[PDB]
Amino acid sequence: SLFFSSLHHSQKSFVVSNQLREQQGELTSTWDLMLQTRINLSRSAVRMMMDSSNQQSNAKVELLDSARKTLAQAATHYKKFKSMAPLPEMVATSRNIDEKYKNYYTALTELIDYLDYGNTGAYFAQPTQGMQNAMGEAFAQYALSSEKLYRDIVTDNADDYRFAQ
Amino acid sequence: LHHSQKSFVVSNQLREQQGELTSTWDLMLQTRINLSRSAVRMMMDSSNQQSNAKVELLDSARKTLAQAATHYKKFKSMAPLPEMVATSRNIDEKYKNYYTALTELIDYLDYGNTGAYFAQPTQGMQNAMGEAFAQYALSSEKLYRDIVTDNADDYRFA
Ligand SMILES: N[C@@H](CC(=O)O)C(=O)O
């Protein structure tokens, strides 16, 4: 049977705590790629404001395509996050992330649609920054909750901890 | 002696170091976003409505970049574990390059040099840091797995 290890006397504990870390990792990747999406969008939008004769304008479409690529990758990681069952103590903060993620994700997909035809006015009018900021704060909150829970688990024994259904 | 306690402290350290690098990376991307938002206002120009925010936006980039550097200093305050030294030094080299790049961009916009701003190969510098971070994360995760599963000899952490 066990010890499995000093930190995880049963190997089930390691499965749980490792889940927890994997969920953080996939949410960190989501956030990273949403911010990369914002960067590619803004680099595209600014070039759509240029004169055609500026050679720097020529990348506007490649950059919007790169936004589409990073936003797809973000959503891939987010699905991986959601595929991993939360622990009960993480359900509330996970729902909070979900709310803010949906808002900011939707926002970014709308900006892609605006730039697709060079509609820079619709792009500027969106209050994107506030949605980004809300996601970032939700992310921070999730990370603090996760870390505190992780420390509770590894210092417990225990070796119960059961995934929420 | 005290193997469990040492494993708890070292695992906590590796997590905290990854968290600080994550914060540094996110804030450097936020700096790059804020720079681009300032550039959008400069391209609207005069009193074209959101255009008067160019300075506030550029100050917001300076703020995120200083916050990045704060987290990076926190990262450096945690001594690397032996098998993490080289990947830590790789992060240092790529961080410094990208940090300098972003300071150059700030300076370009502060002096109205939009051309130099757009011509800098910023993406390559970001990507090089991102690859350094990926290498670091791989190395850290191998060590972490070994520590928390009692598969690490004492030299690696104790
Ligand atoms: N070179 C800067 C500005 C730009 O090209 O839009 C960047 O890549 O962030």
UniProtKB/Swiss-Prot annotation, chain B:
Species name: Escherichia coli (strain K12)
Residues of the full protein shown: 33 to 190 of 553
Intracellular or extracellular location(s): Cell inner membrane
Identification of the protein by name: Methyl-accepting chemotaxis protein II
Family membership: Belongs to the methyl-accepting chemotaxis (MCP) protein family.
Ranges facing Periplasmic side: 2-158
Domain of life: Bacteria
Chain residue ranges for the region called The 3 Arg may form a positively charged pocket, which binds the alpha-carboxyl group of the attractant AA: 32-41
Function: Receptor for the attractant L-aspartate and related amino and dicarboxylic acids. Tar also mediates taxis to the attractant maltose via an interaction with the periplasmic maltose binding protein. Tar mediates taxis away from the repellents cobalt and nickel.
